[PDB]
Amino acid sequence: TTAYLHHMQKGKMIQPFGCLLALDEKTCKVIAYSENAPEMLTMVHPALGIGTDIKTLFTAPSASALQKALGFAEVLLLNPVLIHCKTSGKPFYAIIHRVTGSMIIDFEPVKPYEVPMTAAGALQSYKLAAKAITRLQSLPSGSMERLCDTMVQEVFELTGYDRVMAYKFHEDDHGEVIAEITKPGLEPYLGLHYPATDIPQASRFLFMKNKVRMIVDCHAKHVRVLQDEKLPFDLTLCGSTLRAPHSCHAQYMANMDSIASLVMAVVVNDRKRLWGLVVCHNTTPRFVPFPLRYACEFLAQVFAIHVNKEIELHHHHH
Amino acid sequence: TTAYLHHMQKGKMIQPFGCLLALDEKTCKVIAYSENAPEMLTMHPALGIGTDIKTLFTAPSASALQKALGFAEVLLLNPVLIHCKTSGKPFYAIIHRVTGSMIIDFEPVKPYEVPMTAAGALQSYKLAAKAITRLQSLPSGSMERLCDTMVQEVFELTGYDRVMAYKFHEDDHGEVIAEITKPGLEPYLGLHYPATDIPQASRFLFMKNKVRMIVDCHAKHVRVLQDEKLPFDLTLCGSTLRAPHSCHAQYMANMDSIASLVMAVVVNDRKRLWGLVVCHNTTPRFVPFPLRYACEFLAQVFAIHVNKEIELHHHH
Ligand SMILES: *[C@H](C)[C@H]1/C(=C/c2[nH]c(/C=C3N=C(/C=C4\NC(=O)C(C=C)=C4C)C(C)=C\3CCC(=O)O)c(CCC(=O)O)c2C)NC(=O)[C@@H]1C
Ligand SMILES: *[C@H](C)[C@H]1/C(=C/c2[nH]c(/C=C3N=C(/C=C4\NC(=O)C(C=C)=C4C)C(C)=C\3CCC(=O)O)c(CCC(=O)O)c2C)NC(=O)[C@@H]1C
């Protein structure tokens, strides 16, 4: 069963669009790093390895903000942090989460001349999502079809992907594409049913906790995460924004002409279950910044509430 | 409206919490500045008329403001986080346009706020979006319950001592129809006020400037100087920093509302100013632009629900 989960947490591979550090929960020093992190974060005991102090990597407001995060509980972390590398000023969004023993930081590059617009762009992303949420709210109740069609249209406009689908899980765990919008000319997948095994339990289980997942390029060469072999626990990457897709799925995307994807879990009663996914595909590589993904998380949460109301209301009328 | 509009539209006095520049769209050079701008933005001659912003700000900052000249008002995404070239001091630059001028308000940012710039913007908008979902799920039918919820939500989001819903009657006089305060404050719930307490000129400006903040009614106002070559006065009333008229400043001091934040409630935005959400604080208070921006959208949603409650009511 869960030889799948072993590889999906302890696989130690990330997507190369960003890099990863894990810091010790007490010393704040590097205990693990992706192999691309030296070249991404430094110009260059190298400049970056096990035991590196982050005060040597980043400017003082940047390192200061990460040191302070080492003091904050998980739910109290406000992401992302805007960080600059020492000397170069090279900027990244740092997205922080905690595992037992460690603070994990995903670093996603930002275009330097866009740094002045970071707050502006984050507000605009959430504003657009918030407007989408008001349009979901004003929909007349009583039609799951209208709700799902509206949601895929909103996600399509917000995210700019080639294809957006609502993928519903049936009682037997097989899935169905129940709503879809594409750029003109693409073949539809609307209506198609797919076996339970296309989306393994481990992936469904992960979606309960990791609610938005982005794959930038299914063909990109994955990068290993190295950790001190004496670290008294294994570092899991299930929470990382950068976690590489399992090679099977990477192959699956290749076969389907989805080079890129963005997937939002739809969890009702967040008893709790995965109702389905909002699945975005792109024909070419696609990156969208963490603020938009964050705004999409809330949109998906509101959608799930409305989904569950439509279920209740058609459970009642019958 | 005769006299008031002249002075308010020119907006030659600002609050000292921030500073203002106006740039000529054609040249990108300074054509107006608040008298505190030299001290705030500098430590190449003095900042004055004719100054090139490439001498005031770091290169990415100056480029971001120069790029803003090529956006229609409606397409400006605010704020811009700028750093001063000499000091490295950070500010939020809030940009608006008046014809061929670009007007920039600069509000200081604390050094530890800079790395959390996007994080704090998302959190402010997330809190406001959650407030919006609670407004939406309110059962229809009660203007009172709607306004009560709104003042509660604004109170929690903004941290002011007092939040009121202030409704304009057909004769333009006002009534406080909902209120929440910290314990011990004197209530104004239910009180009616004359139309003249909020002049037409003020009500007209709220149609366009939807959120207005006063940090400290006692603070000494700062003059804006403009290019002597201009044969007319610039309009600076779009500024976030515009100083309150001294009559209003006195009224606040009288009332022991030292600070305020006021949101316009415009229905059919039939288009009219239904009222105001009025926040007061006993002591000075500043809230940063991203939160005020998020408040603007909360107020817009509120206005939609107010007009629904009006229509549900005219149906009975
Ligand atoms: C390999 C032997 C098997 C397998 C494994 C597998 N699949 C996933 C994850 C996903 N598979 C998805 C399938 C679909 N996506 C679509 O667009 C459609 C239909 C139009 C289907 C049916 C989706 C979605 C996911 C989620 C991926 C994501 O974005 O996170 C995984 C986990 C991948 C990971 O590492 O997270 C694995 C191991 N898939 C197969 O087809 C075979 C049977
Ligand atoms: C001066 C002779 C007259 C006058 C002028 C005046 N008033 C305003 C603006 C406002 N007055 C407000 C009044 C209230 N605030 C409250 O909390 C209550 C009741 C509880 C009332 C009635 C409010 C609000 C405003 C808006 C101010 C804001 O925050 O923008 C103005 C415009 C000031 C400006 O510079 O924008 C002027 C010129 N007020 C008087 O009382 C007398 C008659």
Side-chain angles (χ1 to χ4, degrees), chain B residues 228-241:
Chain B
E228 289 287 349
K229 292 165 276 315
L230 293 165
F232 50 83
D233 291 317
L234 295 174
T235 297
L236 305 183
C237 61
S239 171
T240 68
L241 308 176

Side-chain angles (χ1 to χ4, degrees), chain B residues 192-245:
Chain B
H192 290 248
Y193 297 81
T196 50
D197 287 15
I198 309 182
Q200 185 191 107
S202 170
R203 296 183 259 116
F204 176 77
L205 284 207
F206 273 119
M207 305 298 297
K208 321 274 149 36
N209 302 355
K210 298 282 195 54
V211 175
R212 195 287 168 83
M213 181 174 66
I214 299 164
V215 168
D216 179 357
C217 62
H218 296 296
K220 187 162 195 310
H221 300 154
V222 175
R223 302 189 330 249
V224 178
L225 296 180
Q226 61 170 54
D227 188 348
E228 289 287 349
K229 292 165 276 315
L230 293 165
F232 50 83
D233 291 317
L234 295 174
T235 297
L236 305 183
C237 61
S239 171
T240 68
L241 308 176
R242 183 175 57 80
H245 184 293

Side-chain angles (χ1 to χ4, degrees), chain B residues 164 166 197-199 206 212 242 244-245 247-248 251 262 280:
Chain B
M164 290 174 301
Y166 186 101
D197 287 15
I198 309 182
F206 273 119
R212 195 287 168 83
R242 183 175 57 80
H245 184 293
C247 181
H248 184 67
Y251 189 92
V262 177
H280 290 172

Side-chain angles (χ1 to χ4, degrees), chain B residues 65-111:
Chain B
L65 299 177
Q66 166 165 111
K67 299 278 197 186
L69 293 180
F71 291 95
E73 170 84 0
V74 159
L75 270 44
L76 286 170
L77 309 180
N78 281 310
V80 184
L81 185 35
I82 70 79
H83 296 256
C84 297
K85 183 178 203 298
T86 306
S87 62
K89 278 194 169 171
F91 293 77
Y92 277 143
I94 304 113
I95 304 177
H96 72 275
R97 296 309 303 284
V98 182
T99 65
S101 303
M102 190 170 73
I103 302 158
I104 311 168
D105 299 313
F106 296 84
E107 304 183 357
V109 170
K110 283 147 163 188

Side-chain angles (χ1 to χ4, degrees), chain A residues 31-265:
Chain A
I31 60 172
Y33 62 103
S34 59
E35 280 201 290
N36 59 343
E39 60 186 279
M40 223 179 238
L41 302 176
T42 80
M43 293 258 94
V44 180
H45 211 359
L48 196 167
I50 306 300
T52 292
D53 194 296
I54 66 172
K55 297 194 298 308
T56 74
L57 296 175
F58 309 120
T59 69
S62 297
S64 163
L66 295 182
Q67 294 178 137
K68 284 213 255 53
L70 200 84
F72 298 144
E74 177 62 85
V75 293
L76 198 84
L77 285 165
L78 302 178
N79 280 310
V81 184
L82 185 302
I83 71 90
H84 297 266
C85 296
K86 184 170 284 202
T87 308
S88 69
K90 193 186 188 202
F92 296 80
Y93 282 148
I95 304 106
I96 310 177
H97 67 282
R98 301 195 74 83
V99 301
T100 299
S102 184
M103 189 171 79
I104 299 183
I105 311 160
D106 298 309
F107 298 84
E108 300 187 0
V110 171
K111 179 171 186 189
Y113 269 67
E114 292 178 358
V115 164
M117 303 307 294
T118 56
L123 296 166
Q124 176 72 358
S125 293
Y126 220 104
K127 177 178 169 170
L128 293 169
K131 289 185 169 186
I133 280 165
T134 73
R135 291 184 291 273
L136 286 185
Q137 291 179 162
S138 68
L139 269 182
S141 292
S143 175
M144 184 66 85
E145 170 189 83
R146 186 169 61 254
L147 175 62
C148 289
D149 294 350
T150 295
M151 177 66 170
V152 297
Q153 276 144 47
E154 293 292 352
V155 170
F156 177 86
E157 287 299 307
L158 188 67
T159 64
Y161 286 67
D162 286 338
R163 176 183 315 264
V164 182
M165 294 170 286
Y167 190 80
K168 166 181 158 215
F169 288 113
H170 286 269
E171 287 182 334
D172 66 8
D173 294 339
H174 95 276
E176 182 186 357
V177 182
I178 62 157
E180 180 177 57
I181 181 176
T182 81
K183 284 181 188 178
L186 279 58
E187 299 174 345
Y189 299 148
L190 183 67
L192 288 178
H193 294 250
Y194 292 82
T197 58
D198 286 4
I199 311 191
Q201 226 295 293
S203 171
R204 285 182 277 111
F205 180 79
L206 289 204
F207 276 125
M208 303 302 285
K209 302 198 75 148
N210 279 230
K211 297 285 185 53
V212 177
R213 169 84 196 291
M214 181 176 68
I215 298 165
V216 171
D217 177 3
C218 64
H219 295 306
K221 179 165 182 282
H222 300 155
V223 172
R224 283 155 36 231
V225 172
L226 312 173
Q227 72 172 69
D228 195 302
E229 284 163 7
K230 296 174 303 313
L231 192 64
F233 53 90
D234 187 294
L235 255 198
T236 174
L237 301 185
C238 334
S240 170
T241 66
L242 299 176
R243 183 178 59 85
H246 184 309
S247 73
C248 184
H249 181 62
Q251 188 57 62
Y252 189 89
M253 286 174 76
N255 300 340
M256 182 165 304
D257 208 17
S258 69
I259 296 316
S261 57
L262 183 67
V263 175
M264 298 161 231

